[PDB]
Write an enzyme that holds these catalytic residues in place. Structure first.
Site, PDB file in Angstrom:
ATOM      1  N   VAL A   1       0.859  -1.175   0.000  1.00  0.00           N
ATOM      2  CA  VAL A   1       0.000   0.000   0.000  1.00  0.00           C
ATOM      3  C   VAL A   1       0.897   1.227   0.000  1.00  0.00           C
ATOM      4  O   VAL A   1       1.727   1.398   0.901  1.00  0.00           O
ATOM      5  CB  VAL A   1      -0.955   0.017   1.198  1.00  0.00           C
ATOM      6  CG1 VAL A   1      -1.668   1.355   1.244  1.00  0.00           C
ATOM      7  CG2 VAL A   1      -1.951  -1.121   1.084  1.00  0.00           C
TER       8      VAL A   1
ATOM      9  N   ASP B   1      10.864  -5.123   8.489  1.00  0.00           N
ATOM     10  CA  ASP B   1       9.690  -5.119   9.353  1.00  0.00           C
ATOM     11  C   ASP B   1       9.547  -6.525   9.924  1.00  0.00           C
ATOM     12  O   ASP B   1      10.473  -7.340   9.849  1.00  0.00           O
ATOM     13  CB  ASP B   1       8.438  -4.662   8.595  1.00  0.00           C
ATOM     14  CG  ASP B   1       7.337  -4.146   9.525  1.00  0.00           C
ATOM     15  OD1 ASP B   1       7.112  -4.766  10.587  1.00  0.00           O
ATOM     16  OD2 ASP B   1       6.695  -3.129   9.184  1.00  0.00           O
TER      17      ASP B   1
ATOM     18  N   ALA C   1       4.174   4.322   3.197  1.00  0.00           N
ATOM     19  CA  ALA C   1       3.856   3.127   2.427  1.00  0.00           C
ATOM     20  C   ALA C   1       4.018   1.927   3.340  1.00  0.00           C
ATOM     21  O   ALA C   1       4.613   2.020   4.411  1.00  0.00           O
ATOM     22  CB  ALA C   1       4.742   2.981   1.189  1.00  0.00           C
ATOM     23  N   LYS C   2       3.498   0.786   2.899  1.00  0.00           N
ATOM     24  CA  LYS C   2       3.567  -0.427   3.705  1.00  0.00           C
ATOM     25  C   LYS C   2       3.276  -1.639   2.835  1.00  0.00           C
ATOM     26  O   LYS C   2       2.332  -1.626   2.042  1.00  0.00           O
ATOM     27  CB  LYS C   2       2.575  -0.372   4.869  1.00  0.00           C
ATOM     28  CG  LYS C   2       2.677  -1.551   5.807  1.00  0.00           C
ATOM     29  CD  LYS C   2       3.950  -1.522   6.622  1.00  0.00           C
ATOM     30  CE  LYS C   2       3.752  -2.277   7.929  1.00  0.00           C
ATOM     31  NZ  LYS C   2       4.493  -1.647   9.061  1.00  0.00           N
ATOM     32  N   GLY C   3       4.079  -2.685   2.998  1.00  0.00           N
ATOM     33  CA  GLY C   3       3.902  -3.877   2.195  1.00  0.00           C
ATOM     34  C   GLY C   3       4.301  -5.150   2.906  1.00  0.00           C
ATOM     35  O   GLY C   3       4.576  -5.136   4.109  1.00  0.00           O
TER      36      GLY C   3
END
Ligand SMILES: [K+]
Ligand SMILES: [K+]
Ligand SMILES: [K+]
Ligand SMILES: [K+]
Lengths: 410, 409, 408, 410
Positions: free
Chosen positions: C53, C139, C98-100
């Site tokens: 995202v 992460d 952002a993040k994935g």
């Protein structure tokens, strides 16, 4: 003993033309030579390092074309000769390509299929910036095939988007051309008829001996017999068979696919494998390996025509013996050019995004080879030379003209 | 002592626990390129040359290496130097890999217009194989800053203005300040680092400097300014001596005026073949390779040899001088000030902003002391001499980066 | 979940934010799902879904971690990506959020499969990220080696690109001080917070809940600034000392063992009572929702430093809002991590690594400025620290959005 | 909906083939799914935010092809099904495309033409890096048209240069193809003759009932009557009309265009609009909407052939009922593929920089659809299944082969 002759024929052609020594030297030096490291993990986890390479000889007449050879023996001189040979061959064919040649020094029989894909994809990663739709279009060769091209296509497309025109010889499902399988063999039958017609003869009735029964030889036999040719003797790795009344090629093919060789074929007597080239006939088609006609057996050749379907089957020694005997030799650089021509057609079909029906593929092939034989004929009349020299002078002339038209700097 | 490079590498790989398969991969260069360079000569006729570039390793960053215009090209030597640069940049702790290239040609037989023409074709033939983040060439034998200017100019036609694509540029085109003194200044830095480890300092020590070119003169200048006593210096014109100390500023005026040291009042002339065996503390071979060899190693009186030149000590002399207790600051470290500052030139071009010379020199002191610290700690780890400590350190760093980046599972 | 969105609309109403602009600020810029199919070590195929995202890039390239975890809540991923957009704005670093990640269980994969998957994922998204587009970071379930593999694989498509990921190994261009970054940040914000009230870290009593990467680092630097760490809990148990736990000695004990339970120099205490320990400053540093309705009235600290993410859910927020408990919000307190990840990128952009003292010294500068900017928002809107942080961050994104415009 | 049957048909076809369950799982998962924010200023200046999206399901066989829907209703599952269907549809047609599907959740009936262009360009800006001449080629769909495609073409070209092949359905002035209007209807007539020829029959003489008279239905009746087909009953939006000797289609077409419906045609008696499917004939063409044939009306269908011109016109229950009656069903995935096939030809013409005359478009259309029908039948012969499953198995097989040939990395 016939591939070291490549530079010899070139220098001969350059002298037949009035080629300036400075231009000749430029034509001899390849445009680019690349060696790359290809390290992959083997199935046992350990590392394995191979050297991949690509000689890109000449691009004056268009993108370079050449096979990828998976073979442990890599001679720098030998590979360079092949890349240069491709430059003249593509010029003789009048297809807009230059000559190239590459490979990986490796033994595919000692690698798992998992390792061969891994190795092929790394090699593609290491050269993707050196080849391309309009730069250098590889093709299968010794040790590689349609699956290899598929893997190259897939990995290459990751770096540049979908690019079916980046390699030829692909599977049909991935954009390969119809008629690719029969191409070289069909060209051999085409070129044979062109030459025979020049002597008031046709394939119909003639007696053929075909040495070698791989892809090229088998297809030659099929299409030639379908033209009325009388195939009287055929050999392959398993043995040699003869039938003075003509081998039923359809029956032979059915036997050959099932039994994995021509040996044991009912309907043809087995014969001495070393008598195949000296068997009595009209037309001899060396279709397996190089150097098979040499000083040791040239006087014993009985054909008036030798159709060099294989590459370098006739050494220089035998070349002059058979000339002084009235034997005409259709040189390999022309005789087996149907393959690379149809590969040009495969590339065209991919560039145009729309595949051709096989009748068109074959029709264009006949056109290209008819024209190139005519030009080949007229070069011989111009320089009063044999067919082989006519082909080299024709090829070197075209490359030289394109080179000159494009110019050098200032 | 150059072909001895594989010997140093193969030894270092054994000092480390390097797997034989990884060792072979480290030997194989990443890429080898040969290209045709054909140009029209001033008389209109064609001339064909072969250009080339061996790109040995890029695990630790973009490749770095000189461009040599020379008619004699040995493939093994070219590969050896590219490999050497891979270890050297690793010793320097600068994020480069090793490369080496050139054109087989004799510039003394080419007009200057032909040399620009030839350089531009070569750039056109390789531009897609080098780049700001790929391979940053630099001058070498037969090339200089003007050549780099031409490469920069032609390359920029293909990729826009790219001053960071070559180092050794003129200052006017983004070359670095302090670039001339870099190697020489580095030698003095490494000397003090080595002496400080022995509780000694440059001040007072007696120096013999064989060779008086850019590197030799700059070392002599900066070392004398630190209180060093230069008791003998030799160059192509001869050798002069003064046991009480040669006045380097005065000598520099004489040598700039008289294009050599022979004729300098304030130093007696001496045998040019005696320069290496003169009595001193610190001997600086700064001209040629192999000048310290099997025949004269026992006769060295210096307790320290500062390898400003490349390969000044043959393997033979290494062990003789090792056992006699001579500490040798190896070339791979001692003259790294040059390649270090070329990294600084590139950094400045990357950052779009040039450094003051004081910053250039100050970063150089930082980089060479810190690399000496690590070099020292490796020798203690493996109980080896400085040269072997440097190779093991360099090979270890590359191996670390290679392993961290992986080979695709 | 919706926990973040609750703060956002609140901040959006505190400012005069247009409702239509607010809707756009909520909608992420991009949502990507890609198939990641690899051969497993036994040869069979395995298919995973990768995702990313990309919430907002108004203020610069997007920044966010890659999480290898089998549980993937779309609501969480979007919330985390949105949070990163606000977090980077409070930190005043030129990034968006952002993040994935990949839905997968790394504990069920060989390193060979994990590398294969990581490279395949990179191939599937390399055209969607970049040094000036979107810079991933480790992460849950990934670490520096994962970043190394991404760096290696991405560079085949775009040349050497050390700045394409942060959290790299130092051997490959990672930053010094990166490991202590978040922990040091919590110590910095604690001092800023105390200085506003006429106190300093020196002398204050700390109870530190959680002793992972972040918690251990916090205890270290506070003890060195004169802080008295009087109680520490982690996954293995809890230890207390009214006169102060020797953090170096505790670290020596924990580094040998897999926990502090058994540490000479601090007697053990109840693992669930650490939150209600008597002290001045309480630092939740493990998990979310741990400060709740059940224990909020029994907190004795006047200061709460939200080192973990969402450690106080709305319920306790309002309980502690009254009676004078100060809470330093997670969005600011653990921003030291994302700040030093920016410095790693800057160093890679500049082709020249920084000394560690510079990394930490700039870290001090960036967090001080942001705290000052944070406090003035609280004074401007007469609100608590958490809302002050959201108002500051969302204000910055909205201002950047408006300056750049919408075509018109 | 027989739409939700998509996953139903696939797992069947995957099981008919020997598809590894894990490969079946990968073929099911789309290659890529994208959501992008599309915020534009409305004409009153205020902001409006929309979500654009594109499911890019599979590209093993080539660039992806799919429509763009401007519609307020966006079901993620349904969109995924449509993109997946397109993968199979292009594989049955043997055109070198994979399946994709996209759009913008919005109601164009609530937007000015200026806002629709603004929104269209903003959407292009947000996805231009994800589509392309060789990556993904959009096309019109519900709520979009040739003008939409022109705006996409124009905005995309700012980012990548003139790229007429990036979308199909363009206006002819911008490189759209001739014959695109009649394509689906003409394709219906082509497949009908192919189907009949296997039964020793031809279009000539047989009775047609055509339910629905839109673009596809009207064109079909036109082309069918011209081959001698007897269209005995027609339905449309205004009602149903019958004529036992055959409705004069040219005359009716004149009547329908001026009046905008069939209500009032001299030369055909009106009949019950709800009785149209049960009329007696040989070939019944559901050509309006899906699910119009179900269990309640399956037993009394009088045709031996049903040509699924509409999409999903036959519910699963009736498929088996009509099989249990000797009714042959030409499935929609094949029957209405003329549209997507000609869209491939439009793309080809743009790739080649040279437009085809209409007769060439139509002749190639005939070639592609006969070839795919012949292939579809041989699949049925191998798997002893009906036409609908023969098409899915054919499409899924081709995608599976391409996927396997290209391989998975290691
Ligand atoms: K050449
Ligand atoms: K290597
Ligand atoms: K947004
Ligand atoms: K798939």
């Amino acid at each position: 003993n016939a591939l070291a002759a490549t530079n010899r024929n070139f220098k001969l052609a350059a002298r037949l033309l009035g080629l300036d020594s400075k231009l000749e030297k430029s034509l001899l030096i390849p445009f680019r030579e690349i060696k790359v490291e290809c390290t992959i993990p083997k199935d046992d986890g350990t590392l394995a390092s191979f050297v991949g390479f690509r000689v890109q000889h000449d691009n004056a007449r268009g993108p370079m074309k050449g096979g990828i050879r998976y073979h442990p023996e890599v001679d720098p001189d030998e590979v360079n000769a092949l890349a240069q040979l491709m430059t003249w061959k593509t010029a003789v064919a009048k297809i807009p390509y230059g000559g190239a040649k590459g490979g990986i020094g490796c033994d595919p029989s000692k690698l798992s299929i998992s390792e061969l894909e891994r190795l092929t994809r790394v090699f593609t990663q290491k050269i993707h910036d050196l080849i391309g739709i309009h730069t250098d279009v590889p093709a299968p060769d010794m040790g590689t095939g349609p699956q290899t091209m598929a893997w190259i296509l897939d990995e290459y497309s990751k770096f540049h988007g979908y690019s079916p025109a980046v390699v030829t010889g692909k599977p049909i499902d991935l954009g390969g051309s119809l008629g690719r399988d029969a191409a070289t063999g069909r060209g051999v039958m085409f070129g044979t008829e062109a030459l025979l017609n020049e002597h008031g003869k046709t394939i119909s009735g003639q007696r053929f001996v075909i040495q070698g029964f791989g892809n090229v030889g088998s297809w030659a036999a099929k299409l030639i017999s379908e033209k009325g040719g009388k195939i009287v003797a055929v050999s392959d790795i398993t043995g040699a068979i003869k039938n003075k009344d003509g081998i039923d090629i359809p029956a032979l093919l059915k036997h050959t696919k099932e039994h994995r060789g021509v040996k044991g074929f009912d309907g043809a007597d087995p014969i001495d494998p070393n008598s195949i080239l000296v068997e009595d006939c009209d037309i001899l088609v060396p279709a397996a390996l190089g150097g098979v006609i040499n000083r040791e057996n040239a006087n014993e050749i009985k054909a008036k025509f030798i159709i060099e379907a294989a590459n370098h089957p006739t050494d220089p020694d035998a070349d002059e013996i058979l000339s002084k005997k009235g034997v005409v030799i259709l040189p390999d650089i022309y005789a087996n050019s149907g393959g690379v021509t149809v590969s040009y057609f495969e590339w065209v079909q991919n560039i145009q995004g729309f595949m051709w029906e096989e009748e068109k593929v074959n029709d264009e092939l006949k056109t290209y080879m008819t024209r190139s034989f005519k030009d080949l004929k007229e070069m011989c009349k111009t320089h009063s030379c044999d067919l082989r020299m006519g082909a080299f002078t024709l090829g070197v002339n075209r490359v030289a003209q394109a080179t000159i038209l494009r110019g050098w700097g200032a």
